[PDB]
Amino acid sequence: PPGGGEQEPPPPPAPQDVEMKEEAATGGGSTGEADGKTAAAAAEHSQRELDTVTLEDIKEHVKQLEKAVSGKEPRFVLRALRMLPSTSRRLNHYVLYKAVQGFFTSNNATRDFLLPFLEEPMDTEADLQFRPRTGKAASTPLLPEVEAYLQLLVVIFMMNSKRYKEAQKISDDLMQKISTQNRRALDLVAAKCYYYHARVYEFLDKLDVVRSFLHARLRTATLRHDADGQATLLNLLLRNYLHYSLYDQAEKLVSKSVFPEQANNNEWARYLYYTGRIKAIQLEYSEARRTMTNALRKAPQHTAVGFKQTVHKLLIVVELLLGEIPDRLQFRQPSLKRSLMPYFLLTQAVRTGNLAKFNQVLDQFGEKFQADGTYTLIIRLRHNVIKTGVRMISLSYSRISLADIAQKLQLDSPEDAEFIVAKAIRDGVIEASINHEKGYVQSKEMIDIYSTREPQLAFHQRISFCLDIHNMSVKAMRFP
Amino acid sequence: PKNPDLRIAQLRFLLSLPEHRGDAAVRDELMAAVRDNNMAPYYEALCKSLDWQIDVDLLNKMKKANEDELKRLDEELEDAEKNLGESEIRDAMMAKAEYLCRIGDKEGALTAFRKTYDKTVALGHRLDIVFYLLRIGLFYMDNDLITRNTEKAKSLIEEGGDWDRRNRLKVYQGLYCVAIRDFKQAAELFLDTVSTFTSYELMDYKTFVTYTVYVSMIALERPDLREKVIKGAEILEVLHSLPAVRQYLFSLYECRYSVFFQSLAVVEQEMKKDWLFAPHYRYYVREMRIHAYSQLLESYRSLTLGYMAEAFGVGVEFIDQELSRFIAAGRLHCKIDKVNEIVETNRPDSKNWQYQETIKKGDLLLNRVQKLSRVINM
Amino acid sequence: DKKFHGILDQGEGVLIIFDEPPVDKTYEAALETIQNMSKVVDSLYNKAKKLT
């Protein structure tokens, strides 16, 4: 008891230093940033706000409990108060509570006590200028609060937090609307909060009506005011719509637009991941391979953690259906390797020309594919395994017997030996000419057209890409 | 002052991969552990090997006697630094300081190295420090710091010119090129051959004969292969000493395909036990296959696999699937007629392969610069 | 020995000579990409210094 008793005092003041001055310098800086400049946006403290939310989300969040700093939840949500010249005295009151916690023990009030607390910005009457500062001061305890996952009686307080946030959203839609600039700082928050909507709804019930609300918001952004918001709303849509049948596939074509400009950076690329799986369901790989590859090269630098690895899990799927696949252990990660071991044996047996080798992996390792929902490829990949085997045997043998080729590929009968080749010629897989008497299959090697057509088609991508590098370099070079 | 520790790296690789050797591989390692008082090196091997029973006081009185031997030099410097001179103090401490870190880990070495780099006004002791980085680079198989100091030493060496240390570095870059996979640069840097003779950092010279001859059978073309062994006088005797290694060379020039399985058999058993070859040995297996198949298929335009059964004894379907997988890899294109037992050559590869290397490397290079281009900015 | 170019036949007893001498145009490109390796590698040091 003496040791732990003396180790209790030191921790609580560490946040009570940083977390006290954190949203006071960031929120209080964005307070003057919101009055003017306001160009664009920027509001560079909005990017700093991403960094701060992610800062507490590692350490120390809000609470707990901990029976020490749990009084910060009512502290920052109290005392607007009220107009800016009256806020000086309140900024001093925030510091008076430091001596209160230093003299006597700190008071903890959470859970049922949060109902009047969250209604105290409405009781103060009022902030009254900044809805995003009140949305941030109310959300900042609520957002890491989801990390409790107690699921009993405080989730309906998260529903009350969506209701209080909807009050702040009525105030977001009615107020301003001409050079709003509160919306552009709030669209990051409407993003995060709507993702927390779906997060909380995943633990109870999927949201059918909240998508009616979400689509009201979605379509209502265009054309009046959309900055960075609708790009996130479309990904909210796609996120549970990809998990929930159906039609959502062609839904994107009527939504686009694009929507430009792509934001926020990697946040657009992940959108390309979602639509990459979607466009994979239409079996078009050429459109799917580029959207998959762009997702990985457009996302730096991690950590964290496993979703950047999963996007790569589905990256090489479309390339495996293509028939041309690079060896995937060049992207091998110590945290990723352990996860795709069964998957890695899959691609290992896929690149081979043995059909039985491939059918064994589905039997033993299908249990993992059930969780990923990746069985959509396993039916259509067989076509690619047989096409791979026949490609090998085509280039590697001048003249092959159709009856003797069936034993190696376990083709089992003479009749399908003609069928594979028939569609092989139909798809341009092999140029060989086949004679049916016995029958036999002969093949010929033709070239010299070759470097006429193929390199110029590549050059069309090469040079255009190089001049695009030139344009992107000139753009960032002319700013000084 | 290296080979006693280098052979310890040999025995740690000998213990690590095979789990079937529980006797002669631990005995020689403890034989070298009771001496020189290696302390930190055996902890990593204690986790893999057995935990005994008892080490404890047996190695605790030795590490305390090593710390008394450590503190007696550390107690000699401040009586030595009272007087003063040029290097006579700081150089007196560093040698035994790197031996004291030879007892354990990388620490006392890494501090002593950056310590002495500001002391010596000549490359004599500098490159000796570099050699310490190379030997430790072999023990901990850490290739990070050995590529740097070597690049920095080549500039101080060639300002400039050298004999012994130059031909030493020629072998060092061969050890790094053989650690990773580089076949042409390894044999090129191995051109000094007997001029380095026996050296402690070069370990056994008889085994250096074998290492330098194992690379010459790949990246060296046949005219040049016999150009090195037949025309080179210094290398002609050492091969005459070992009849097993000589067998492979003269049988390779003799083109006899019956012995290649038996000779590569021995070469493969030695490839497994020796270190650094574990990653790279499986590529070598097929390397020598295509190198024999080259001279094979270049003689006759039409050939039958039934004739190959006579030289191979006896391949039927074996070489069928074999050659098929060599063709699928774009290695020595040849057109084989299935079920008709005919092989055709061709291949006038100077057309497509001439132009194919350009696309193969071009795609990888430009795909690299694509990532670097999108990095800046964000 | 490469001093002579062609191909033989054991069955028909036929030697055929064929030659396509020039290798220069590929050497052009090959020796380029090989050095451009160290080009990009050298760019990673500056790109790493500006960012961190």
């Binding site: 890409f465 190089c466 960032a476 070079m477 000084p480 | 071009g362 900015n377 | 990009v40 500056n46």
Partner: peptide, 30 residues
């Protein structure tokens, strides 16, 4: 190939030297 060879070099010198001369020169002024 030579085109794309020097295109990356132009972007190299330009972007590297300019981004440094942009943020590192502005940070000392303000």
């Amino acid at each position: 190939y030579l085109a794309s060879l020097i295109r990356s070099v132009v972007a190299l010198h330009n972007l590297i030297n300019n981004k440094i001369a942009n943020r590192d020169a502005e940070k000392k002024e303000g």
